[PDB]
Amino acid sequence: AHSIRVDGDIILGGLFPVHAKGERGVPCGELKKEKGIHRLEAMLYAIDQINKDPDLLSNITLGVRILDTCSRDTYALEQSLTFVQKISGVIGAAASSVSIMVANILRLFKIPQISYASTAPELSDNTRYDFFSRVVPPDSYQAQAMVDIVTALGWNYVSTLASEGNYGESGVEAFTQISREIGGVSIAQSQKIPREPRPGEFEKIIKRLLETPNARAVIMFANEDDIRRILEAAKKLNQSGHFLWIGSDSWGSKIAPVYQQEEIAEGAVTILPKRASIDGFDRYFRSRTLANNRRNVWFAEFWEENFGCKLKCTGLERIARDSSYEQEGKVQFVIDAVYSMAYALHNMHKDLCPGYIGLCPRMSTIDGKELLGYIRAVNFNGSAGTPVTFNENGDAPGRYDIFQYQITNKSTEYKVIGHWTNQLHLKVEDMQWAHRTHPASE
Amino acid sequence: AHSIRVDGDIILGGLFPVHAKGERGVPCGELKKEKGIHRLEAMLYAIDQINKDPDLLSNITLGVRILDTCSRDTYALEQSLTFVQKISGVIGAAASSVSIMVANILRLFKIPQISYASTAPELSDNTRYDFFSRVVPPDSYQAQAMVDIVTALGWNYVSTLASEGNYGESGVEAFTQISREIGGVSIAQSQKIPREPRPGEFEKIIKRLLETPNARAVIMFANEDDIRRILEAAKKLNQSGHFLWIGSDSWGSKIAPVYQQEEIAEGAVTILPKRASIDGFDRYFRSRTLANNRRNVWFAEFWEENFGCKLKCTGLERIARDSSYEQEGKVQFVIDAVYSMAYALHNMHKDLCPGYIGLCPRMSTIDGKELLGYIRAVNFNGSAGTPVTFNENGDAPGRYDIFQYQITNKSTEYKVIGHWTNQLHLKVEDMQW
Numbered sequence A: 001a002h003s004i005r006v007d008g009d010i011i012l013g014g015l016f017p018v019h020a021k022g023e024r025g026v027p028c029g030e031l032k033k034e035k036g037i038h039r040l041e042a043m044l045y046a047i048d049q050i051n052k053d054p055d056l057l058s059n060i061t062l063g064v065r066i067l068d069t070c071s072r073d074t075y076a077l078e079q080s081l082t083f084v085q086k087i088s089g090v091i092g093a094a095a096s097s098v099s100i101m102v103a104n105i106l107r108l109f110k111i112p113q114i115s116y117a118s119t120a121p122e123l124s125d126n127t128r129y130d131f132f133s134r135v136v137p138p139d140s141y142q143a144q145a146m147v148d149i150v151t152a153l154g155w156n157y158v159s160t161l162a163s164e165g166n167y168g169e170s171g172v173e174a175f176t177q178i179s180r181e182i183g184g185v186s187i188a189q190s191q192k193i194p195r196e197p198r199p200g201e202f203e204k205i206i207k208r209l210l211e212t213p214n215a216r217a218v219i220m221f222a223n224e225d226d227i228r229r230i231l232e233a234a235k236k237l238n239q240s241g242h243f244l245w246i247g248s249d250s251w252g253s254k255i256a257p258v259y260q261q262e263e264i265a266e267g268a269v270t271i272l273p274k275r276a277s278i279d280g281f282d283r284y285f286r287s288r289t290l291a292n293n294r295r296n297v298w299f300a301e302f303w304e305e306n307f308g309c310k311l312k313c314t315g316l317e318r319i320a321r322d323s324s325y326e327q328e329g330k331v332q333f334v335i336d337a338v339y340s341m342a343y344a345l346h347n348m349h350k351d352l353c354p355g356y357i358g359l360c361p362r363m364s365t366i367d368g369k370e371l372l373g374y375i376r377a378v379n380f381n382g383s384a385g386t387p388v389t390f391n392e393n394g395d396a397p398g399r400y401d402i403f404q405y406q407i408t409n410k411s412t413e414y415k416v417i418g419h420w421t422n423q424l425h426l427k428v429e430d431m432q433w434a435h436r437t438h439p440a441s442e
Numbered sequence B: 001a002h003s004i005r006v007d008g009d010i011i012l013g014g015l016f017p018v019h020a021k022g023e024r025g026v027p028c029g030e031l032k033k034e035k036g037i038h039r040l041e042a043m044l045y046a047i048d049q050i051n052k053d054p055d056l057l058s059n060i061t062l063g064v065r066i067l068d069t070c071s072r073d074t075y076a077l078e079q080s081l082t083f084v085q086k087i088s089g090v091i092g093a094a095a096s097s098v099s100i101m102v103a104n105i106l107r108l109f110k111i112p113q114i115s116y117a118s119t120a121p122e123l124s125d126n127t128r129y130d131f132f133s134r135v136v137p138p139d140s141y142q143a144q145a146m147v148d149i150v151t152a153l154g155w156n157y158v159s160t161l162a163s164e165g166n167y168g169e170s171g172v173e174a175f176t177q178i179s180r181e182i183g184g185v186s187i188a189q190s191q192k193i194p195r196e197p198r199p200g201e202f203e204k205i206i207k208r209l210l211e212t213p214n215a216r217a218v219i220m221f222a223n224e225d226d227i228r229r230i231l232e233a234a235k236k237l238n239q240s241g242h243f244l245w246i247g248s249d250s251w252g253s254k255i256a257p258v259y260q261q262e263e264i265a266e267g268a269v270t271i272l273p274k275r276a277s278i279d280g281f282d283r284y285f286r287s288r289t290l291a292n293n294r295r296n297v298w299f300a301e302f303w304e305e306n307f308g309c310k311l312k313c314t315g316l317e318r319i320a321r322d323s324s325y326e327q328e329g330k331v332q333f334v335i336d337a338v339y340s341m342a343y344a345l346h347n348m349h350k351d352l353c354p355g356y357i358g359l360c361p362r363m364s365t366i367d368g369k370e371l372l373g374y375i376r377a378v379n380f381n382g383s384a385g386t387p388v389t390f391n392e393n394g395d396a397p398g399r400y401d402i403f404q405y406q407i408t409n410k411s412t413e414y415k416v417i418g419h420w421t422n423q424l425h426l427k428v429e430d431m432q433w
């Protein structure tokens, strides 16, 4: 079976992009190490810590039903059909278009949903997505953050690039609407990366962006696989230093789009929601091996991809020791999403079963509308010490960290250059730039 | 029951916007006479004709299951779940955003879909919507036709108006893409009508269009209810001779957006896919009464809306005789969608059942992938006499009729001023201002 299934008292659903979308038609392709495995194992980590915890859900064990989405909303729709036939809540998904398609069918069967990565403004709708919630802020605030950064840098002439789907198109739309409403920020052109990219499509996009030579700055709402190929095409056409990249949360502080393409990505300003690196997950993930992690059905494929061998592999390899490892940026949000579900179940248990230590007969079948009420009313400190809470729409506060990709001597890092919390707090003095030429006649 | 269920050998699904979307938290609202009932009854008419026909599907009766979409895609998704868990094929829907959501769930259970009104270019994609087909052409040709009409009339400065959803936004996007490449057409502003509009919204939209008074021409990709309220606000602010209206297929030759607002809609150039009025349906629909049409569950509500009475109503009222009636513009496409399904089942019957006059043991279960091939390869003269065919993508050819709303003395009509078949053919001599 191509699924992770662990039995418990209350079973929680899981949607993760373990594999990236295949090239042209093919549903599933290459494995996602950071975006897939790191986040998937973070849910398993959280559940293990909750079941261990004597205070949170005493004498109660959470179940597991993790399914692969293959970076496709169409593929995730038929996978989400297995949730409805027992599943009490769903953690996920990653991409907004994927979360939207699943939320359309979960609301009819009244199953609460908490996402860890989906940021599309449409998901804030309390009528169309009444059972949807998220521990990440909507793109309404991220677009405003990117407007402020562009204003501070004085780049009044910008181009926009987006991946086909809700996140890319409506994220850029949010940036465009703010530009038209207030300020002197003007948009040169809006390009869209197709969902099924043709051979040589990425080379054509770069050439299309060169049709406005004055527009050096590019606002980018694209997935990590698209960013890598955009930067690859920019290197292929010798456009080093020309484009000034502005990346959203899908870019973040990720190693995937910049791997082996460090020089072309220099000086790129990136956005990511307020998060911290969790030491607890790092200790757990490093201890995971081929021998002890049979629970993860995709871990064998991960082993082959992480160390670069065929199952050639000794089995005595260790993560972070034999290969490069850094915790994925949204690992915190996966853990905080599971805890938000757990605390809500704990709070519902206190009202329905006031005496019994464990699952009582009154809490035999979990009501979807009732559980959702406890999710929205929950208030606790997360896995990083940061408070986790939901508003009237079921969204997280608009809090962001701003990074810049910098190269010094030989080392590369995403240096924290500022943060956006209701208003901008950018340090221009700490920003570094690469050396440049395209003449204009307009 | 809130649906029409007629049992047969092969059951066909139907999705029709009987009611419009509600105002507040309400899902279903006002009953649409033309867009809803006329088209719904056209499917029932088509099925009645096929069952009567001794040549097409001999000794085989087609069943039907028609559901209400209530103009909402989220409501239509709930209804479309009753088709799955037997349905061999689904006919519908009208709106593109509705058809898209339905096509997402039908492909998983391999149920072929033929639409009569949905024109969004996204639906042409063979990877995303592999089981979707349509007897109407995509908006990519309709947007090009609009650019040609705008260029020929000498309207270099234009404004765009779109209803929230796949049809409005992608229809305007396609227009903008062609206008961005060409030099003869330039866009002043792009307005978007909200899906859930607040009070006083339509008057604000008109005021925003008046911010650029040189842009008199307005290209509209809006639904029946949205066009009406746009024209209502324009009449309210006395903007009669100022605006020049360009209407898409959702405007067409319909009377619903222009009812009691004839003066404001004068000289409006509208487009519609090539169609003809069918005499066979008109004879059928005029004979439909409260007494004989118990089949249609919404017909009692339609009767109150059509004649303006309460069940006040005598029952002796007659359609066309007592109330103003004209066949809806897309009635042909509904009928041709059913015949496309019928001929495909007829051609599959010939290959699977050698010489049987009826269902053979091999025709026990209808394979969706196999039926899809017979739908795409179908070739027949339709209900209007015009040929019905599908291409590699599953689309009809980009053939359109161009109309203009003209007023003479007291009479009002949508006069044919030209047609678009890959190239523009506009008759300037038949236009009035």
Ligand SMILES: *[C@@H]1O[C@H](CO)[C@@H](O)[C@H](O)[C@H]1NC(C)=O
Pocket (backbone or CB within 6 Å): A059, A357, A358
């Ligand atoms: C936990 O639950 C089990 C089974 O219901 C029961 O036997 C046990 O006594 C419980 N333990 C505690 C500490 O309440």
Ligand SMILES: *[C@@H]1O[C@H](CO)[C@@H](O)[C@H](O)[C@H]1NC(C)=O
Pocket (backbone or CB within 6 Å): B059, B357, B358
């Ligand atoms: C129609 O089908 C029925 C039942 O299978 C059969 O009895 C009858 O002979 C058929 N009619 C003709 C004209 O073949």
Ligand SMILES: N[C@@H](CCP(=O)(O)O)C(=O)O
Pocket (backbone or CB within 6 Å): A035, A094, A095, A096, A097, A117, A118, A119, A120, A167, A223, A224, A249, A250, A251, A330
């Ligand atoms: N907000 C993004 C997901 C961020 P990721 O690429 O998973 O790191 C989306 O909704 O598509």
Ligand SMILES: N[C@@H](CCP(=O)(O)O)C(=O)O
Pocket (backbone or CB within 6 Å): B035, B094, B095, B096, B097, B117, B118, B119, B120, B167, B223, B224, B249, B250, B330
């Ligand atoms: N082409 C339109 C439908 C036209 P109608 O308003 O049903 O007459 C759409 O795709 O939404």
